[PDB]
Amino acid sequence: YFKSQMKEDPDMASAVAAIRTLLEFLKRDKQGLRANLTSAIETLCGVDSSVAVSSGGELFLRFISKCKKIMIERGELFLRRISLSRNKIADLCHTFIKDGATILTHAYSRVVLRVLEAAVAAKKRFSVYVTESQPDLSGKKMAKALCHLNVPVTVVLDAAVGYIMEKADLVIVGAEGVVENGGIINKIGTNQMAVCAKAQNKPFYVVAESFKFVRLFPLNQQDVPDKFKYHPWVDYTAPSLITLLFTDLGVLTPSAVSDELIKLYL
Amino acid sequence: KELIEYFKSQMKEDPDMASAVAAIRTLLEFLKRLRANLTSAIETLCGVDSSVAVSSGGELFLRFIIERGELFLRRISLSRNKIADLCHTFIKDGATILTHAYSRVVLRVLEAAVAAKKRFSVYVTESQPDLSGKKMAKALCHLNVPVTVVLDAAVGYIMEKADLVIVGAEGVVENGGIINKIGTNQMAVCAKAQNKPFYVVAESFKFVRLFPLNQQDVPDKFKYHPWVDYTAPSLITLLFTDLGVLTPSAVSDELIKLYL
Amino acid sequence: GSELSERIESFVETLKRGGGPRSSEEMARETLGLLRQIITDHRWSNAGELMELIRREGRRMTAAQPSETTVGNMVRRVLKIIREEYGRLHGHYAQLQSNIIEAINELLVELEGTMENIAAQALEHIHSNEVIMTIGFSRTVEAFLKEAARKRKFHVIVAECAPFCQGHEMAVNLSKAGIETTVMTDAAIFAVMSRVNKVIIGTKTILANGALRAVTGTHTLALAAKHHSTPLIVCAPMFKLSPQFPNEEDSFHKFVAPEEVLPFTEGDILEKVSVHCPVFDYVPPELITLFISNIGGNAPSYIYRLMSELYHPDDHVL
């Protein structure tokens, strides 16, 4: 389709790429537009299998609730809100890091990197531990990106997750999707690390935006859709293993995100 | 040194043995041609091969010890068969086995189970630092067993699909814990969090005079990206050794009786 | 004129240099009175400058003593009332002051009624021949126990705080009404476990995630209750709801002079010994069972819902 040629900017994610692709292709019409938008969303997720992309596409198409003048104006403002959501999340989350603390991360995440950069701009000293992310090497690239921030970093293997757990002070990771009950959907090496953190009583923090809220209610690891897992690339984390969630709608408890999901009408 | 040639030759000749077994062979083969030199040989063997099994075997040989040297390896040759016979009973038909690394003892246990006319599935961890789960899977596939290989990061995803966990151990400590591959502690924690049995299979010459309290108490000469870790005895359900089936709380008395 | 400013600096000084009213209800009442007087005798032609002035005064009061989250709640409630009145009228500039005064008066009446509303629900959660444990001195738990003991008979164990032995006064006050109380130190808390049927305690404030800030030694009591699976019910009015989540908060506890812990007459060893005397502590929300207030018992997971009505989200930072 066209999402591939907007991948020229590595800073932006795949879901926002699909959102802006839909916005650009919206002004090509020559009601029945709902079917066209649904087919466009389906073609968009047919290339990349991500829950975040589908949730963002649904939330974008949700603004429906010639007469096309009103419809077009919403896309640019929506994109601006997603753009400012990252800064808002970073501002809300940078206050939870103290001097000399140890931070454990799983893989590459632009939100976590922005939060860390805000914390470093707040004149704080900390160390970061990143899992090597064996399936696709992204933890080492995250460490390389953090290297020029003058932040001490160290990459560890995904096998050595419970070995350095006692040396960490808090755990913050991103999320590819927030389910209705309160859990998160992330990389494969997330649930076991959360379990280890819970066993060691270490805090578990999740940072995600408001366009990743999906309406799913899994009960185990096999309840997630098969199209999203594809060696699986995605798992499910129980809401009881998450301490706090930092979004653009404010700090929310795992038991409080359900009300936000319902009010979002997604 | 003056014995590294024999050490390397012994490692190259036969693949069935272990590092501790090779050290024992070198020791009693150099015995014919004494405490100080034997201790120096044990120390240099441990320095060349950083593993607690080699040190445990050398210390046990030094305590036990020419006519008395044959008994040790003659016993440990059939100790593996005894352990396999003791452990193969605990496997039921249709069960799922979750292994982490490549070890010959658990391979013998699984082959005895399959020779006892039993059907089961085996899950192995790829062992990212040195790829050994793939080697174990390739060595076990020609036993007519449906074995699949999973990632190191997928341990917590396949926990609900496993009935029991069987792993090896490179060394047993006083409190009843084990010193296994670096990815063993997380697997034990996940199994405990889901009420999954955790069975440890090891021999008797892997006993050390160590009482670790956390991951920092392991000596640096043994971990060397660490290679091994420490597992709490509370996360172990049962232990299968040549001295019979042992509870985690009963390992200390056996270690005391064995005189380390 | 100058009288309002003089009362403002007097309140700020009496908040900063030391403690104020003994009871939190009186503190909230006088804070509301100060806010009403500030609103009354001031020159403001629009709502925006009034809200800015109220926010500045609230910030000054918070900076005077951040350990107590009582004045800030009143400032946030007043700001929410101002916003509600502005939205009702504009959605004006003539009858705003009278509506504000009426809202303040009804809020004061409700605050006065919270005590009776909380005390009225004593018989439901307390039965005869029960063991109840309290730590420190609290005016709400005392009223709860005294109202529940006028129709039934049970046993109460009171443990005093080591630095400030305020539990002795609570035990004496209870025993003056025939409750058969017991006095013991904080060391024998785990030992007294396995025989207590219910735990009723108070708190200084309630955080956003359902957590609360109480006197020292409450964390050990909560841990023991969780270990022995005993229920833990906390009685606190609606003005103790803090809209701030638990941050790093290196100054969360109030640190006082080490005289209470170690006497000054120890000798020359005081020059190389570090003594710390924290007052408050942090209790995780997972160790709490029920939250009793003036509108009825609620789960710890209803804290955010209860807070959302009370305070506007933009006033969380004040």
CA angle A16, A19, A25 (to 5 degrees): 140
Most A CBs within 10 Å, among C242, C247, C248, C286, to test the A interface: C248
Of C210, C248, C313, the CB nearest to A98: C248
Tokens linked to C21: 């009213």
Backbone phi and psi for residue B187, each to the nearest 5 degrees, phi listed first = -65, -40
Please state, in angstroms and rounded to a whole number, the distance separating the CA atoms of residues C31 and C18: 16
Stated as kind and residue range, the H or E segment containing C84 is helix C71-90
Please state, in angstroms and rounded to a whole number, the distance separating the CA atoms of residues A124 and C86: 41
Of B152, B157, B215, the CB nearest to A163: B215
Answer positive or negative: Cα dihedral of B210, B213, B215, B217: negative
Tokens linked to C80: 């929410």
For residue A162, the chain B residues in CB contact (below 8 A) are 185-186, 189, 229
For residue A157, the chain B residues in CB contact (below 8 A) are 128-129, 152, 182, 225
Please state, in angstroms and rounded to a whole number, the distance separating the CA atoms of residues B168 and B178: 9
Q: Does A233 touch chain B (CB under 8 A)?
A: no
Stated as kind and residue range, the H or E segment containing C260 is none
What's the resolution in A? Answer: 2.9
C-alpha pair distances (Å), C19 with each of A157, B61, C13, C64, C66:
54, 74, 10, 11, 13
Whether residue C148 contacts residue C122, with contact meaning beta carbons closer than 8 Å, is answered with yes
Q: Does A238 touch chain B (CB under 8 A)?
A: no
Whose CA is closest to C193, among C109, C133, C117? C133
Tokens linked to C3: 């009288």
Backbone phi and psi for residue C223, each to the nearest 5 degrees, phi listed first = -65, -45
The 3 state secondary structure assigned to chain A is CCHHHHCCCCCCCHHHHHHHHHHHHHCCCCCCHHHHHHHHHHHHHHHCCCHHHHHHHHHHHHHHCCCCHHHHHHHHHHHHHHHHHHHHHHHHHHHHCCCCEEEEECCCCHHHHHHHHHHHHCCCCEEEEEECCCCCCCHHHHHHHHHCCCCCEEEECCCCCCCCCCCCCEEEEECCEECCCCCEECCHHHHHHHHHHHHCCCCEEEECCHHHECCCCCCCCCCCCHHHHCCCCCCCECHHHCCEEEECCEEECCCCHHHHHHHCCC
Torsion of CA B10, B16, B21, B23, to 10 degrees: 20
Stated as kind and residue range, the H or E segment containing B11 is helix B4-13
Most B CBs within 10 Å, among A106, A134, A161, A200, to test the B interface: A161
| Chain-chain contact of C209 with A253 (C-beta, under 8 angstroms) | yes
Q: Does A155 touch chain B (CB under 8 A)?
A: no
- At residue C287, the 3 state secondary structure works out as helix
For residue A134, the chain B residues in CB contact (below 8 A) are 128, 151-153
For residue A259, the chain C residues in CB contact (below 8 A) are 305
For residue C305, the chain A residues in CB contact (below 8 A) are 259
Neighbours of chain B (3+ CB pairs under 8 A): A
For residue C208, the chain A residues in CB contact (below 8 A) are 251
Tokens linked to A77: 């403002």
Interchain touch C–B (≥3 Cβ pairs closer than 8 Å) = no
- DSSP, res B165: E
Whether residue C57 contacts residue C75, with contact meaning beta carbons closer than 8 Å, is answered with yes
Backbone phi and psi for residue B180, each to the nearest 5 degrees, phi listed first = -120, -170
Please state, in angstroms and rounded to a whole number, the distance separating the CA atoms of residues B241 and B200: 9
- DSSP, res C264: G
Please state, in angstroms and rounded to a whole number, the distance separating the CA atoms of residues A252 and C304: 9
Of C245, C248, C250, the CB nearest to A251: C245
CA angle B9, B12, B15 (to 5 degrees): 135
Phi-psi region of C93 (alpha: psi -120 to 50; beta: other; left: phi over 0): left
Please state, in angstroms and rounded to a whole number, the distance separating the CA atoms of residues A211 and A89: 13
Please state, in angstroms and rounded to a whole number, the distance separating the CA atoms of residues A45 and A54: 7
Please state, in angstroms and rounded to a whole number, the distance separating the CA atoms of residues B254 and B258: 6
For residue A156, the chain B residues in CB contact (below 8 A) are 225
Please state, in angstroms and rounded to a whole number, the distance separating the CA atoms of residues C160 and C215: 10
Give the residue from chain A lying closest to B226, CA to CA: A160
Most A CBs within 10 Å, among B98, B125, B151, to test the A interface: B151
Please state, in angstroms and rounded to a whole number, the distance separating the CA atoms of residues B19 and B250: 27
Give the residue from chain A lying closest to C317, CA to CA: A92
Phi-psi region of B255 (alpha: psi -120 to 50; beta: other; left: phi over 0): alpha
Q: Does B141 touch chain A (CB under 8 A)?
A: no
- Tokens 């496993």 correspond to B162
Which residues does C contribute to its contact with A (CB < 8 Å)? 208-210, 245, 247-248, 250, 301, 304-305, 313
Whose CA is closest to C16, among C72, C58, C63, C73? C63
- Tokens 């804070």 correspond to C31
CA angle B203, B154, A239 (to 5 degrees): 120
| Chain-chain contact of B157 with A195 (C-beta, under 8 angstroms) | no
Work out the minimum CA distance from C209 to partner chain A, whole angstroms: 7
For residue A256, the chain C residues in CB contact (below 8 A) are 301, 304
A 41-100: CB under 8 A from B: none
| Interchain CB contacts (distance < 8 Å): A and B | 84
Tokens linked to A47: 């290339």
| Chain-chain contact of B157 with A191 (C-beta, under 8 angstroms) | yes
| Chain-chain contact of B189 with A195 (C-beta, under 8 angstroms) | yes
